[PDB]
């Protein structure tokens, strides 16, 4: 029941000029030819999403990716300033397999309705985890994994309001974001189905009602305040950062307004960073919403959360634990 260094693995193409593919070629090995998935019968082991080392490993690997592969022209910190060159490149998330090292293996809870902390009835050991697209997003979750059975809620403590609440989507909700060329290039927009989103939101509301018995008809609202990275739906699309306003979602064809920001609050450290002007023409990005990051206002009223990308990796690495062979 120990922990050690893992190594990334992905079926990356060495000839493509997509940023992710470059770093993968020279920092991650190809995929395992034969997948060794063994189902252990009558095994009970306690998993813990939040005190897991795999999350910090994935966090560290991603940090290096963005730096070496999506570099900022001007970085800003209270103490220091660093100026450098940032060449424009393409950027489309690819899947990454985080394999366990020779001598160790990963235990996998193979039941959808697993809360995240506690014993698992059915556990299966696999040598490599499944491909996890490393998408950095705020508020919303994108290109993620869907819950097989039904929507699931996960958190360290429903009693403590400060702790974030993570939700895994039931059916992938598609969102199609584009900045069309006419003028003012910042103005953009995302489009999302109104009826589909309303149904998914009602489903999450029902799950939250199950968490808090009496089922006080609750309503969602925009984040109170703070830096715009957590208040607004932010995500990287086509190499340019988009800060889309999620005011319509939390309350026809819903359409959100977006704005390409040059300066943004970087999540690697405590500081700011600036990037070059935007690309001139059509930018197209269509992703599958597969969950959300929400927090509870004390007093139930819920507001979007996020900002700390470690939770996103927990959402994807919740059923996986690294242990030693016997």
């Amino acid at each position, epitope marked *: 029941e120990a922990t050690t260094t893992l190594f990334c693995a992905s079926d990356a193409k060495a000839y493509d000029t997509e940023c992710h593919n470059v770093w993968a*070629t*020279h920092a991650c090995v190809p995929t395992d030819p034969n997948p060794q998935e063994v189902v252990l019968v009558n095994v009970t082991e306690n998993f813990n999403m939040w005190k897991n080392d795999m999350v910090e490993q994935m966090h560290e690997d991603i940090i290096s990716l963005w730096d070496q592969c999506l570099k900022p022209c001007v970085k800003l910190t209270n103490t220091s300033v660093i100026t450098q060159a940032c060449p424009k490149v393409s950027f489309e998330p690819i899947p990454i397999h985080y394999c366990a090292p020779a001598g160790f293996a990963i235990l996998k809870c193979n039941n959808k309705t697993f809360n995240g902390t506690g014993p698992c009835t059915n556990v299966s050991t696999v040598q490599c985890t499944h491909g996890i697209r490393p998408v950095v997003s705020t508020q919303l979750l994108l290109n993620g994994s869907l819950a097989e059975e039904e929507v699931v809620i996960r958190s360290v403590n429903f009693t403590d309001n400060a702790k974030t609440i993570i939700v895994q989507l039931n059916t992938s909700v598609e969102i199609n974001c584009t900045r069309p060329n006419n003028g003012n290039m910042r103005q953009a927009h995302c489009n999302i189905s109104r009826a589909k989103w309303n149904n998914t939101l009602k489903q999450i509301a029902s799950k939250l009602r199950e968490q808090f018995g009496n089922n006080k008809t609750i309503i969602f609202k925009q984040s109170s305040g703070g830096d715009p990275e957590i208040v607004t739906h932010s995500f990287n699309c086509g190499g340019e950062f988009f800060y889309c306003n999620s005011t319509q979602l939390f309350n026809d064809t819903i359409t959100l307004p977006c704005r390409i920001k040059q300066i943004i609050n970087m999540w690697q450290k405590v500081g700011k960073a600036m990037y070059a002007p935007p690309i001139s023409g059509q930018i197209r990005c269509s992703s599958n919403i597969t969950g959300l990051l929400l927090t509870r206002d004390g007093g139930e009223i819920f507001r979007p959360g996020g900002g700390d990308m470690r939770d996103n990796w927990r959402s994807e690495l919740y059923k996986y634990k690294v242990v030693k062979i016997e």
Partner: antibody
Amino acid sequence: QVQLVQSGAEVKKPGASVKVSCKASGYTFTGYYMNWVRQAPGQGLEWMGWINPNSGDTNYAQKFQGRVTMTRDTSSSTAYMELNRVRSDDTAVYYCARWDWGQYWFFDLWGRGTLVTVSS
Amino acid sequence: EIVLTQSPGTLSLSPGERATLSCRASQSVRSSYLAWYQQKPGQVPRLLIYGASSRATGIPDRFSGSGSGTDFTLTISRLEPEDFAVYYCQHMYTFGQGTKLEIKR
């Protein structure tokens, strides 16, 4: 007896297509990646591509993308590589290696080598 | 756009003296994806070291690779007349320019 047997030397003209075959006998073919490396006469090594024999997904370098096509035959336990638009720069000795997926990257087995000569 | 530059270009040493070949990479390369091969004139390259600092199966003990980060080192103590050959530094897909070694006379 656990050998990587390559084809014989070939002589080609400018613009033709060259195909060298690397047959592996003695070990499980599907379980290990097959890599293709070439060395020009008196120069350093250069990795060209590899192929996953189990699933058949291939990978080539930018310098070769478009004109190199790699195939494998599970029945006869062989792996063929084809290179189009041959040029005098392609004259080299092509080796094939076998890497079993693992933490570390290394070429354990090496083929005897195939000599491809391109000239007018 | 990663290139491994092997130094020195051409090393000259006599039997019995420890020689150290250095292989520098532009970008900070992973720690365990590095290997070293030896190619004797007119033979297939032989696998000496893999994983930066680990002798492959059967490689003599005198060989020893070490170093992490952008700078790596391949150390050979007690040079014997057979070890004088070409040495190459490989990180995954990118090979080094090569290091030619000569017997001092």
